Swiss-Prot record, chain B:
Residue window of the full protein shown: 1292 to 1380 of 1390
Localisation per UniProt entry: Nucleus; Cytoplasm, Cytosol
Annotated family: Belongs to the RNA polymerase beta' chain family.
Biological role stated in the UniProt entry: Catalytic core component of RNA polymerase III (Pol III), a DNA-dependent RNA polymerase which synthesizes small non-coding RNAs using the four ribonucleoside triphosphates as substrates. Synthesizes 5S rRNA, snRNAs, tRNAs and miRNAs from at least 500 distinct genomic loci. Pol III-mediated transcription cycle proceeds through transcription initiation, transcription elongation and transcription termination stages. During transcription initiation, Pol III is recruited to DNA promoters type I, II or III with the help of general transcription factors and other specific initiation factors.
Annotated consequence of substituting residue 44 to R: In WDRTS; uncertain significance
Organ and tissue specificity: Expressed in the brain, in the cortex and the white matter (at protein level).
Organism: Homo sapiens (Human)
Name of the protein in question: DNA-directed RNA polymerase III subunit RPC1
Domain of life: Eukaryota
Binding site for DNA template strand: 14, 32
Swiss-Prot record, chain C:
Record-listed Zn(2+) binding positions: 2, 5, 23, 26
Name the record gives this protein: Transcription factor IIIB 50 kDa subunit
Region of interest: Interaction with target DNA: 103-109
Induction: Down-regulated by epigallocatechin gallate (EGCG) treatment.
Function as written in the Swiss-Prot or TrEMBL entry: General activator of RNA polymerase III transcription. Factor exclusively required for RNA polymerase III transcription of genes with promoter elements upstream of the initiation sites. Contributes to the regulation of gene expression; functions as activator in the absence of oxidative stress. Down-regulates expression of target genes in response to oxidative stress. Overexpression protects cells against apoptosis in response to oxidative stress.
Similarity section: Belongs to the TFIIB family.
Subunit-level organization: Component of TFIIIB complexes. The TFIIIB complex has two activities, alpha and beta. The TFIIIB-alpha activity complex is composed of TBP, BDP1, and a complex containing both BRF2 and at least four stably associated proteins; this complex inhibits the transcription by pol III via its phosphorylation by CK2; YY1 facilitates the TFIIIB-alpha complex formation. Interacts with TBP; this interaction promotes recruitment of BRF2 to TATA box-containing promoters.
Subcellular location: Nucleus
Zn-finger region bounds: TFIIB-type: 1-31
Swiss-Prot record, chain D:
Shown segment, full-protein numbering: 159 to 316 of 316
Binding residues annotated for [4Fe-4S] cluster, in chain numbering: 129, 132, 138, 149
Domain of life: Eukaryota
Keyword Acetylation: yes
UniProt free text on domains: The [4FE-4S] cluster-binding domain adopts a globular structure that serves as an interaction hub that connects the POLR3C/RPC3-POLR3F/RPC6-POLR3G/RPC7 heterotrimer to the Pol III core.
Involvement in disorder: Immunodeficiency 101, varicella zoster virus-specific: An autosomal dominant immunologic disorder characterized by reactivation of varicella zoster virus (VZV) infection in adulthood after primary childhood infection with VZV. The viral reactivation manifests as central nervous system vasculitis with stroke-like episodes and lacunar infarcts on brain imaging. Features include headache, hemiparesis, impaired balance, and other neurologic signs.
Organism per entry: Homo sapiens (Human)
Subcellular location: Nucleus
Name listed for the protein in its UniProt record: DNA-directed RNA polymerase III subunit RPC6
A GO BP entry: regulation of transcription by RNA polymerase III
Gene name linked to the record: POLR3F
UniProtKB/Swiss-Prot annotation, chain G:
Originating species: Homo sapiens
Coiled coil: none
Tissue specificity field: Barely detectable in differentiated tissues. Expressed in embryonic stem cells and in other dividing cells, such as some tumor cell lines.
Cellular localization per UniProt: Nucleus; Cytoplasm
Induction and repression of expression: Induced by NANOG and POU5F1/OCT4. Negatively regulated by the interaction of microRNA MIR1305 with 3 miRNA responsive elements (miREs) in its 3'-UTR. Transcriptionally regulated by MYC. down-regulated upon cell differentiation.
Protein name according to UniProt: DNA-directed RNA polymerase III subunit RPC7
Disulfide bonds: none
Signal peptide (from-to): none
Subunit structure as annotated in this protein's UniProt entry: Component of the RNA polymerase III complex consisting of 17 subunits: a ten-subunit horseshoe-shaped catalytic core composed of POLR3A/RPC1, POLR3B/RPC2, POLR1C/RPAC1, POLR1D/RPAC2, POLR3K/RPC10, POLR2E/RPABC1, POLR2F/RPABC2, POLR2H/RPABC3, POLR2K/RPABC4 and POLR2L/RPABC5; a mobile stalk composed of two subunits POLR3H/RPC8 and CRCP/RPC9, protruding from the core and functioning primarily in transcription initiation; and additional subunits homologous to general transcription factors of the RNA polymerase II machinery, POLR3C/RPC3-POLR3F/RPC6-POLR3G/RPC7 heterotrimer required for transcription initiation and POLR3D/RPC4-POLR3E/RPC5 heterodimer involved in both transcription initiation and termination.
Amino acid sequence: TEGRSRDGGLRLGEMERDCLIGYGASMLLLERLMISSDAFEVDVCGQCGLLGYSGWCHYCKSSCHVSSLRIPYACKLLFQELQSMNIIPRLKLSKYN
Amino acid sequence: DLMTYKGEVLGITRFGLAKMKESVLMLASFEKTADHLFDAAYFGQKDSVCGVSECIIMGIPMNIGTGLFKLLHKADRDPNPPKRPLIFD
Amino acid sequence: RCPDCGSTELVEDSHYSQSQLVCSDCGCVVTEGVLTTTFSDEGNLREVTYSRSTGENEQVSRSQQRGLRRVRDLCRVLQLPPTFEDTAVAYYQQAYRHSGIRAARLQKKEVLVGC
Amino acid sequence: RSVTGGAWYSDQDFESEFVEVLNQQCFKFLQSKAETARESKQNPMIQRNSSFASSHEVWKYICELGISKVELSMEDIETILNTLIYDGKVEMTIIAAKEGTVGSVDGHMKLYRAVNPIIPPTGLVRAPCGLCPVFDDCHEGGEISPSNCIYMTEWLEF
Amino acid sequence: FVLVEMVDTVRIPPWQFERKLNDSIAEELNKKLANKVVYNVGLCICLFDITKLEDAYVFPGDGASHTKVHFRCVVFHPFLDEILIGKIKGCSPEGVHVSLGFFDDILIPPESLQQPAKFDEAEQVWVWEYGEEIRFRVVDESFVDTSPYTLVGSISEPGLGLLSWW
Amino acid sequence: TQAEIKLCSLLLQEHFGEIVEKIGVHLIRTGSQPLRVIAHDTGTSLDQVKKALCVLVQHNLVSYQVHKRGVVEYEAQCSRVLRMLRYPRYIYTTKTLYSDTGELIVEELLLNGKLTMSAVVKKVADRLTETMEDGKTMDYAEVSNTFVRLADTHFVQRCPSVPTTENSDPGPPPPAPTLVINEKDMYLVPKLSLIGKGKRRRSSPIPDDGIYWQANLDRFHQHFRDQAIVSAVANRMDQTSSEIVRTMLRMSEITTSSSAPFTQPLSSNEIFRSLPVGYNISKQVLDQYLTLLADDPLEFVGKSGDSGGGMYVINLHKALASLATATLESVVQERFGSRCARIFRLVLQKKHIEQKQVEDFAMIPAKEAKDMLYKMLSENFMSLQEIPKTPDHAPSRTFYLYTVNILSAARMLLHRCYKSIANLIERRQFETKENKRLLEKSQRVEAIIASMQATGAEEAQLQEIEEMITAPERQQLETLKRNVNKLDASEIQVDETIFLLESYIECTMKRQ
Amino acid sequence: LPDVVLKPPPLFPDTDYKPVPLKTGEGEEYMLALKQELRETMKRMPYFIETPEERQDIERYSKRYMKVYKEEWIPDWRRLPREMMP
Amino acid sequence: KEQFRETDVAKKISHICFGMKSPEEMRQQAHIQVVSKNLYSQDNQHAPLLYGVLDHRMGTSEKDRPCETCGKNLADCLGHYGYIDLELPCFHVGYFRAVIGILQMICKTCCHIMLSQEEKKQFLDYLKRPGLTYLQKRGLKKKISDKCRKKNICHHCGAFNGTVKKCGLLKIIHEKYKTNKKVVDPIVSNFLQSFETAIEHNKEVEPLLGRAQENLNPLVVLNLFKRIPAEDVPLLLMNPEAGKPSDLILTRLLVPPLCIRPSVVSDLKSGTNEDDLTMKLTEIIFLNDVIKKHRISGAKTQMIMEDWDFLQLQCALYINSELSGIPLNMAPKKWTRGFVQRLKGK
Ligand code: SF4
Ligand SMILES: [Zn+2]
Ligand SMILES: [Zn+2]
Ligand SMILES: [Zn+2]
């Protein structure tokens, strides 16, 4: 929430993230802004490129290309909001190696 | 050198950022989200996630800094181990 | 209830600004975290009432509107609190449910507002 | 009568059964006369002429039937036969009759003859795909699909 | 049975680092594809060999090891003509229920082709006489995760003669 | 064209294979494309691309062109791809017009794209040898006579000819031969002096090189238009009038181009002599028939002059439009109903009309006609003008006039027919695939008979053909077969409807 | 007030109109038999590109006993560009 | 035995492929169809109406009631989409200018892109250049527009086509029957002379002979977009994999999960704060149902057209509640927060 009157934590302003980038603390920045703010688990079908649930793909009606992915909850909300406008985001996954 | 690497002097203004950069999400977030997003979808644009801004947006580690090199665990391994031969073939 | 011990002695206690349910017998938590609306959002969102949702507040003919406005101005000129106005309009809306009441002359509606 | 009242307008309401019955029975008369002319076989031009029925003739046939309470005029039966024409089962052929039992049309006379439809039901109607209620919703892998389209199920079942 | 060239990335937790990588890979793979049918592939049994074992990456997340491995393991998937010898563990009236010896009771022959005395009248009748063999017809797989099976195959027993048992 | 692409993919996968249909679909979707980008984008090897291109261009389904720097770009002919669906109708009309020798001629031309004199006569003679028995032999004489008759009737036309490379640009060869088409030798049949007999398949240099012959489906479509027109005329007015129309069209078959708004000027005097003697008619009866057909509101024919007694001309575009309107009214009647058909014909006669006018004229009360108008509007058959009293063209302040256009409805109906045929092919292929086990079972039970059919074929195995477990399964097979049969026949029927609409779409389009 | 839909409209709304029976006669049956025989003729002809057989494992002499043979046609290379030669 | 399912794959996103869905792919994606305009049941328990907005098979918003479609907790549930069927096609605000441009880019009868074959080939060649950028694509579209609007007849058809412009409120007008100070076209004479019956039943139609041109409704433009040839799709700068041009015309609406739409039951009162989006969805369902009712009862054609326009305006407000071209007389309600408002702004 907002602050002390609302028992809210502090806010990482843009400048703080700028300093973190300048230091290059990639994993620390990722943990601070994703793990410690809003962490979510999503499933993506490589065939369709669309989000899925519980290792299942409704659009492809299959579960042979699902995968797990950690995400900011705000990012998932943005994806779904963009979906509502029929601007469908198709995620093209790639192996980490 | 950044401001002139494209052969023309490019500003740091919104026009400049539209020029040298391409990311759909950054251009949408800067100003006029609806028009930019709908135009990008209309053109059927595909947008990479290599940039740091979207990396933070996408929740993936950035390439700059500690996210550049890959680590390899020096374990005791034998690549291409000896193979048990098939007799039936 | 406790999933393991089965003890139904679940108590609500306030942690360092965290609402959660914990069993007093085994100290095991059964449900933590709570979702509440923020003021920045409560100020933007609009509250809805049952009548307007079901479609009511639109079946208010010219006569019933005139009657409730008369009730309003009457309780206003008397310098009454808003609770009196609310109770008066509620009683009027309750009395207007009868067929013989709504179908009456102006004198009847005026004396009904008065009563 | 054109704008107020009207033979079809009883209580200012169109009489559907009246027009249906009148159309069906006048079509019966037309097809019977056409069949008699077809079996006449006297001569193709005599065939054409004897197939024809004048507006006054069919009007008198309706009057002798007298099914409708409100007496129908010449133009009323003309409109009934025009509705039949709009169905494609009869055709209109004006001939140059300067005077006669009709005497209404200037220098001409109204001849309506029952004719067969030009083409039987064409393709795409033997298959349920033709303007199917879910044709637009029909899909290769949608909720409704030709693999599970119960329209094929029913039609192939027949 | 048949070997399959199976490619997969295996995650090894750090507390097994003292062991040789290949052995831990084999143990995890055995734990990972045991009694688990693979869609359009067949019923995996156990690992046979490990062919390729490349570099072991470490991720900024879990911190354990991940190794992409090419290997070979055995699966059960008949070629629509194989001769089986199973045991009749149950017999529904619409179709007998044969079970391969300790293998799986999922192969269901619909009784429709033996000698023309075909009827299972629900008192557990093996066959209408004039340790049971099988000619496998087809294979089929499905995704059971339709709600938050899948290998049965049809089985046929024609007039093989069967002089050993009628 | 998405339904067109889907149907073309289905047809090419059915008739030729998979690597060929992939390349064909890619060309249809992409248009003109060089070969290297074709191979790269399709993800296929160079040799497979070569195979697909040769098997396609051999049947004249695709072509190639030369561009800047001598690059060869390949293009697909989607209409030509749809054309193979009408092969059975072409075979039937050839079998009706001429003997089965010409039927086999056109069948082999369709299955081979282009063939020379020697190749086609050899194939036709060989295929005709087995149709007969008792040691009789086919000779190349009758096959050659039938082929030259077919070519002279313009049903068979020469391929575009290979240009003389020695006469023009002798030296560095162009990447493609760049064939050219010559009008005057599309029917110039070369002579085959040699006559022989085809082998009956015991299983125990080229005088006609450079010239290849293909089925001229334009002639087939013109003849089919003739047949449809005469069928409509016979349905409406009289058999004799349709005979007259057929005779005059036959007179104009060679004298008129395939694309002509009107036919040649034909006089009734030569119509009388050209009429078969079977129709016992007189000159005055012919004149009366022709005059009343000119007075027929369908206006198939026209006078266009009084010279030479009764001279007459036919209205190709008008007749095609009338046929298209008749088909449209038939299908809308069958799917919506008789009264909605009445409304459709009423609005066809009255191009601009208001809704209450339609109610009054069709004598359909309220809440019934209007629902039909709304539905038949929503199915894209109908259009509204929205004539405003201001120019804001905005809310309840403008008149709405019903106006139906033939062309748009015909286009969308053609698309619907394409998708319907796609659905039918999908259903037949799915039912064939799901029953391929029983298909192989029946194939094996018939192979037991066919293999070793006379040598050692004991009678004591004839009773063992039904011993295979298909005895109840044949029931299913029969159902599948009839369903398959039904589907195919239905599809073929729908195909004829397409030839109507497309013809209008072709005649209404001039392509300047 | 339109009634609230408690159960969604069916996957198939039943139709009042039925498909017309198909054409009957010798011509139609000849059409059908011709098309079905054409199916097999085009399957057998060398223009029908057979899909490459796969997932066959080991060798045997019996391979030579279940061999399916068919002749291979050739196109006219003077009409075809030289680039497409195998 | 048991179907093997790989729980996770150690992959990372490479790039996001933006693209439109067809209203048909849209219906495929959705789980249930929203048909109940009203939200909750009449009983005091306030049970949400099944197959309607705020159904609990469609995601979840309240902690106690979990997702019914997926057996997961309020936090675990990702959410499920629903679909609403539109009886009449509707424009899309984000794609309104796009459809206008395409209609200026293709003809209305031959429907092909309207440029010379040499111009088409030159534009195709300039498009074959690898790595075309966003700005380059916008410049390409502008160049094609400039070179296309200076002609009148397509190579395929040759039909005359005037300028297409937005007239007022989500309305597209094409002045096909252009008024000329020179000799009039024969087609113009045929069109104007064929108002015989309308003039017969309305004299005032005759003064309205001018200023009465072809207006492209969403249904007719949908039909045109269906028949687009594939060849011209790349020349439209439209990637075929992203979506076909028929997807631009919106005839179905994906209602997003209950995760995006909160339902804050204000315990201090007898009410639930609700998003304006849910109210607009309810209004859309009501509009579709009343359009069905009016079609059944045979209202005026003009009334049906007003219903269609009001549906278009409702969808426009749902997409973006800040538009400067709505029906002044047909006052909707008050200021609301749409999806764009949730996206843009500080
Ligand atoms: S639902 Fe079936 S019959 Fe109807 S259009 Fe689709 S495939 Fe054809
Ligand atoms: Zn998927
Ligand atoms: Zn406990
Ligand atoms: Zn969920």
